[PDB]
Amino acid sequence: SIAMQTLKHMPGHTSREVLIIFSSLTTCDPSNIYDLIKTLKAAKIRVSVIGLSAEVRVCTVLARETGGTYHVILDESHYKELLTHHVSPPPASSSSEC
Amino acid sequence: MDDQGCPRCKTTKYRNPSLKLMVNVCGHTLCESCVDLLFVRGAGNCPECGTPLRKSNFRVQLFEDPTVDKEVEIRKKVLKIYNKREEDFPSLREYNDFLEEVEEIVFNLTNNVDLDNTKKKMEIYQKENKDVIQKNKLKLTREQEELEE
Amino acid sequence: MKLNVDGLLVYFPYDYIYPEQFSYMRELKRTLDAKGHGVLEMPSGTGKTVSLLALIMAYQRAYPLEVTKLIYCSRTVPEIEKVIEELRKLLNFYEKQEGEKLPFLGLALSSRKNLCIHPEVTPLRFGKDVDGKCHSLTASYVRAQYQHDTSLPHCRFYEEFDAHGREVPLPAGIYNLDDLKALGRRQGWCPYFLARYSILHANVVVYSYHYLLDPKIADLVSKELARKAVVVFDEAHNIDNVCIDSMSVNLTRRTLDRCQGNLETLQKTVLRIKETDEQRLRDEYRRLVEGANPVLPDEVLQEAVPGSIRTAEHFLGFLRRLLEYVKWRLRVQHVVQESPPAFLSGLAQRVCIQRKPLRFCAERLRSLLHTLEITDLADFSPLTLLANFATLVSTYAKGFTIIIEPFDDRTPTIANPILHFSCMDASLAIKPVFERFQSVIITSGTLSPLDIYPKILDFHPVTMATFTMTLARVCLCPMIIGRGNDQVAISSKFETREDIAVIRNYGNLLLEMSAVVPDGIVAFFTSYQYMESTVASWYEQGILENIQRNKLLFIETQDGAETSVALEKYQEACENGRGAILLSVARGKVSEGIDFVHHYGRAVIMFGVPYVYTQSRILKARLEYLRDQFQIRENDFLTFDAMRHAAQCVGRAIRGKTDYGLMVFADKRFARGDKRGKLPRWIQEHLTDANLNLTVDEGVQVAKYFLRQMAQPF
Numbered sequence: 001s002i003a004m005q006t007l008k009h010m011p012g013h014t015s016r017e018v019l020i021i022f023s024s025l026t027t028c029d030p031s032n033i034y035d036l037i038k039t040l041k042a043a044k045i046r047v048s049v050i051g052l053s054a055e056v057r058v059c060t061v062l063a064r065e066t067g068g069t070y071h072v073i074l075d076e077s078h079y080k081e082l083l084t085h086h087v088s089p090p091p092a093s094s095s096s097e098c
Numbered sequence: 099m100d101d102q103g104c105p106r107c108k109t110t111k112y113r114n115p116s117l118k119l120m121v122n123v124c125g126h127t128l129c130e131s132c133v134d135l136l137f138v139r140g141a142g143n144c145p146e147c148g149t150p151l152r153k154s155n156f157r158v159q160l161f162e163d164p165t166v167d168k169e170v171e172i173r174k175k176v177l178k179i180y181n182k183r184e185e186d187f188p189s190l191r192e193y194n195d196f197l198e199e200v201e202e203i204v205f206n207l208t209n210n211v212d213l214d215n216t217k218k219k220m221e222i223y224q225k226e227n228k229d230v231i232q233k234n235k236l237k238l239t240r241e242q243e244e245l246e247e
Numbered sequence: 248m249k250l251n252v253d254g255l256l257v258y259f260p261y262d263y264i265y266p267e268q269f270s271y272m273r274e275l276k277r278t279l280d281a282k283g284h285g286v287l288e289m290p291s292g293t294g295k296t297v298s299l300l301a302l303i304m305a306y307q308r309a310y311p312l313e314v315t316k317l318i319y320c321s322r323t324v325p326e327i328e329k330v331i332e333e334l335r336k337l338l339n340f341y342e343k344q345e346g347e348k349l350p351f352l353g354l355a356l357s358s359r360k361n362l363c364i365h366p367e368v369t370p371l372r373f374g375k376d377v378d379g380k381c382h383s384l385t386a387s388y389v390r391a392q393y394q395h396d397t398s399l400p401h402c403r404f405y406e407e408f409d410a411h412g413r414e415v416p417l418p419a420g421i422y423n424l425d426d427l428k429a430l431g432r433r434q435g436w437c438p439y440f441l442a443r444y445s446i447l448h449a450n451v452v453v454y455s456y457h458y459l460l461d462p463k464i465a466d467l468v469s470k471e472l473a474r475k476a477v478v479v480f481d482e483a484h485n486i487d488n489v490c491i492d493s494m495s496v497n498l499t500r501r502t503l504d505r506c507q508g509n510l511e512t513l514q515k516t517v518l519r520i521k522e523t524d525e526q527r528l529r530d531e532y533r534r535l536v537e538g539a540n541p542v543l544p545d546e547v548l549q550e551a552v553p554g555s556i557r558t559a560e561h562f563l564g565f566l567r568r569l570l571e572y573v574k575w576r577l578r579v580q581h582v583v584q585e586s587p588p589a590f591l592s593g594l595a596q597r598v599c600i601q602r603k604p605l606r607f608c609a610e611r612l613r614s615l616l617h618t619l620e621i622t623d624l625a626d627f628s629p630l631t632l633l634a635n636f637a638t639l640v641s642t643y644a645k646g647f648t649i650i651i652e653p654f655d656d657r658t659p660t661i662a663n664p665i666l667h668f669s670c671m672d673a674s675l676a677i678k679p680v681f682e683r684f685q686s687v688i689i690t691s692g693t694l695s696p697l698d699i700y701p702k703i704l705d706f707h708p709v710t711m712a713t714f715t716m717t718l719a720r721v722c723l724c725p726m727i728i729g730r731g732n733d734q735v736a737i738s739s740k741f742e743t744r745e746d747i748a749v750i751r752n753y754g755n756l757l758l759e760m761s762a763v764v765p766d767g768i769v770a771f772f773t774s775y776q777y778m779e780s781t782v783a784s785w786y787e788q789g790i791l792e793n794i795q796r797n798k799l800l801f802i803e804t805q806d807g808a809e810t811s812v813a814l815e816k817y818q819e820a821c822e823n824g825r826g827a828i829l830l831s832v833a834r835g836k837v838s839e840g841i842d843f844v845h846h847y848g849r850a851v852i853m854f855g856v857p858y859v860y861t862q863s864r865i866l867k868a869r870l871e872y873l874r875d876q877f878q879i880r881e882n883d884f885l886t887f888d889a890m891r892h893a894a895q896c897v898g899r900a901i902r903g904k905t906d907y908g909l910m911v912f913a914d915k916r917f918a919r920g921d922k923r924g925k926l927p928r929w930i931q932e933h934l935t936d937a938n939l940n941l942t943v944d945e946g947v948q949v950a951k952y953f954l955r956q957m958a959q960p961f
C-alpha cells in the first residue's frame with residue numbers, strides 16, 4: 001500500500017516495479033491482500049517477489065497474476081544471480097504502454 | 099426396574115431395584131413388599147381389582163408389560179399343545195397354518211372367553227395325546243440337550 | 248495420445264503418461280483378460296481415474312460382449328463428482344477423435360436428498376425425512392388416488408416420468424448430479440428415477456459403496472442384469488469398515504423407547520383402519536398366504552412364507568414380545584456379554600420366539616406397514632431398524648456376534664446402554680459382489696500391503712502388484728522423527744502418553760516445523776482425548792503461544808458444524824499469508840472426507856501411530872475372530888489397521904499435478920521395520936535409511952532444504 005501510494009502518481013510511461021525480498025513466510029495484514037491484488041493489476045505495477053527459505057503461495061499468486069516472477073533462494077551465490085538478473089529492465093508486455 | 103413404582107407402594111422401586119414383578123391371573127403388576135401386604139389380608143386377592151387367586155398366583159417375572167406377562171404365560175401353556183414338528187406335514191401351507199391357529203388361540207385366551215378354547219383343546223387332546231404330544235415331549239429333552247452343547 | 252497397449256490401442260486425453268501409468272494399464276488389462284477379480288494400488292489421487300476409465304472404455308470397444316458395463320464406486324459424492332468430471336473430459340476427447348457421437352452412456356447415482364426437484368422436500372436435508380416424504384408422494388395409494396385426481400398434493404414428476412421415460416430412454420450423454428437436476432427440472436422428470444432406469448442401459452454407472460454393499464438398497468439396483476460387468480472400487484482401502492457398517496445395527500435404550508411409542512401408534516392406526524376400511528386392506532392377508540428393505544443378501548434371503556405372523560395383530564404381538572425381550576436383555580447390568588447363537592436360543596426359549604418366524608419379521612414389517620397407509624416411514628424408522636436387527640439375528644450368526652454394553656465408554660454411570668450387533672468379517676457381506684460380478688478391481692491409494700486383503704475378504708486375486716509413482720522431480724520427501732532434541736524416545740505409547748518430555752518434544756517439533764514450513768499444515772493425532780491433553784500441556788507451557796505467533800492455529804472437534812467452520816477458515820488462512828496449523832484426529836471424518844492439494848496441507852504431520860483404544864469390545868470380537876479364522880495375528884491386524892489409517896491420512900498431499908510436499912511422522916515406531924514394510928510401496932521406496940530416524944533439528948533442516956529444492960521450477 002505504501003508503494004502503491006507513492007507509485008500511483010508516477011507517470012504512465014515509466015514502468016512501476018516492486019521487488020519484495022520476502023524472508024518471514026508469515027504475512028499479518030489489516031486487510032485481505034487478494035483485494036489489493038486487483039488494485040495492483042489495475043495500476044499495472046509489476047511485483048516480482050524473491051522469497052527466502054519458503055515458497056509462499058500468496059506471493060506466488062501475487063507474482064504470476066501481477067506479471068512478476070517468483071523465486072526462492074537456493075544459496076547466496078544464487079541470490080547474487082537472482083538480483084543481478086532483476087537488475088536488467090523487464091520486457092514490456094501487452095498491458096505496458098509507451 | 100425402570101418402572102416409576104408400584105401403584106400403591108412406590109418406595110422400593112426407588113431405593114433398590116432388587117424387587118422383581120410377580121405374575122398373576124390378573125396380569126397385574128406386583129412387588130414383593132406388596133405381596134406381603136396381599137398375604138396379610140385376603141391371601142391371594144388383587145388389592146384394587148380383587149381378583150381371587152387359588153394360592154397367591156405368584157411367580158417371579160421381569161417383564162414390565164403385564165400384557166406381555168399374560169401372553170408369555172399363555173403361550174408357555176399352549177406350546178404343550180400343537181408341538182408337532184413342521185416336517186410331519188408335507189403340505190406347504192399346513193406348515194404355518196396350524197401355527198396361525200395356535201397364535202389365534204393365544205390371543206383368544208388373552209382377552210376373550212376361554213370356554214370355547216378349552217373345549218377345542220379337549221378335542222385336540224383326545225387325538226394328539228396318543229402319539230404326537232408324547233413323542234414331541236420326549237424329543238424335547240433330547241433336542242435341548244444336543245443344542246445346549 | 249493413442250497408446251499402443253499390448254492388448255490393444257487405447258486413447259488417452261492428456262499428452263504424456265508416466266511409466267507407472269504404463270505398468271498400471273498393462274496389469275489392469277491382464278486382470279480383465281483373465282476375467283478374474285483382483286486388487287491393485289496406484290499412488291496418485293488423480294490420474295488413476297483417467298487411466299482406469301480410458302483402459303476400461305478401450306476394452307469395452309474391443310470386447311463389448313466381455314464387459315456389459317462399468318460400475319465405478321467412490322467414497323463420497325463430492326469425490327465422485329470429480330470422477331464424473333474426468334469421465335466427461337475423456338468422452339469429449341474421444342468424441343472429438345472419432346468425429347461423431349457413439350452409443351455410450353455414463354451417469355452417477357445419488358440420494359434423493361442430495362438431488363431432487365420437489366419444493367416440499369427441498370428445504371429438508373435429513374435423509375430419512377426425504378426418503379419418507381418421497382415414499383408418501385410416490386406411494387401406490389397416492390398413485391391410485393392421483394388416478395382419481397382428487398384434491399391432494401401429488402408429486403407430478405414421478406407420474407410424468409412414468410408416462411414418458413418408460414416409453415423413451417435417454418439416448419446418450421454424460422450427466423453430473425447437478426446437471427441431472429437441471430435435466431429433471433426441464434423435462435419434468437425425476438433426476439433420481441431417470442438415472443435408476445438408465446442403469447438398465449448405461450455403459451458407466453458411478454455411486455458410493457452404500458449403494459452397492461448394503462443388501463437393503465444395493466441389490467435392487469445391482470440386480471443380475473450386470474452378470475459380467477467391471478465393478479471397480481476406488482480408494483476403497485477402508486472397505487472392510489464400511490462393509491461391516493452395512494451389517495452392524497446398534498440398539499439403544501432411547502431407540503427402544505421410541506420403538507415402543509411407534510408400536511403404540513401402530514396399534515392405534517390398526518384399530519382406526521379396522522373401523523374405517525377393513526376388507527380392501529385385508530386382501531393383503533390373502534396375498535400374504537399366497538406368498539426400508541430386507542437386509543438379507545440374494546441367496547440368504549428367503550420368501551417361502553411369512554410364518555406364524557399372518558395378521559396385523561399377530562405381527563404386532565410378535566414385535567411386542569421381541570421388543571420386551573430386547574428391553575430386558577439391555578436393562579441387565581453386567582460386564583459386556585457376547586452371544587451370537589446363544590442370544591437366538593435364549594430368545595426362543597425365554598419368550599417363545601422361533602427363529603424361522605423371526606426370519607421374515609422385517610419383510611412382513613415392510614408389507615404390513617405399507618398396508619397401513621402411514622404418513623411416512625421417518626417416524627417409524629427406529630422400529631424398522633429393530634426389525635432389521637431381529638431378522639438378521641435369526642438369519643445368521645456364524646460370522647457375527649451380539650455384544651451388550653450396559654455401560655457406555657467415557658461415562659462412569661450413564662442411563663443409556665447400547666446393544667451392538669457388530670460383524671467380525673466383511674467377506675460375508677461382500678461375497679455377493681465377488682460371486683455375481685465376473686471381476687472386481689479394488690483400486691486404492693495408500694493401500695497397506697495387499698497380502699492381508701485376500702485373507703480378510705475371501706477371494707482369489709489374479710494380480711498383486713504395487714505401483715510406485717515416478718516423476719522427473721521428487722515430489723514427496725517423507726521422513727520419520729523418533730529422537731527429539733533430548734535424544735529421548737518419542738513413541739506415543741499408552742504408558743508413554745502422559746510423558747511431559749514427549750509432549751514437549753512434539754510441541755517443539757511443531758513449533759520449528761511451522762516456523763520453516765510455508766502456509767498450510769495439518770497435524771493428525773491418535774484420539775480426541777490425547778489431542779486435547781497435548782493441547783492443554785502446550786497451553787500450560789509457552790510453546791503454544793509461540794506457535795500461535797508464528798502461524799494461526801485451528802483445532803478439530805466432534806461437532807460437524809464447528810469442524811466445517813474451522814476448515815472453511817483454514818482454507819482462507821492457507822490462501823492468505825497467515826498460514827494455518829489444523830489439528831485433527833486420524834479417525835475423524837474430516838480426515839477421510841477432506842483432500843489436500845497444492846498449497847493445502849503442504850507438510851503432513853503425524854503425531855503418534857494411529858491406534859484405536861484397546862478397551863472397545865467391538866474390536867475384540869472383530870480381532871479375535873480374525874485370529875481364529877483366516878489366521879491373522881492380533882498384533883499383525885492391529886499394526887495393519889494403524890498403518891492403513893496413517894497412509895490414508897498422510898497420502899493426501901500428493902493428490903495430483905505434481906505438487907510438492909513432505910510427510911513427517913513424529914514417532915519412532917514408524918522407524919520399525921514392520922511399520923515401514925506395511926507402509927505403501929511408493930512412500931517407502933522414497934523413504935531412505937539416511938532420513939529414517941532424523942532428530943527434530945535434523946528433520947527441520949532437511950525439510951527446509953527440500954522445500955528450497957521444490958520451490959524452483961522444473
Ligand code: SF4
Nearest residue numbers: 363381402404405437
Ligand atoms: S418422486 Fe421424484 S420429484 Fe417427487 S419427491 Fe421423489 S424424487 Fe423428488
Ligand SMILES: [Zn+2]
Nearest residue numbers: 104107129132
Ligand atoms: Zn406394591
Ligand SMILES: [Zn+2]
Nearest residue numbers: 124126144147
Ligand atoms: Zn389387578
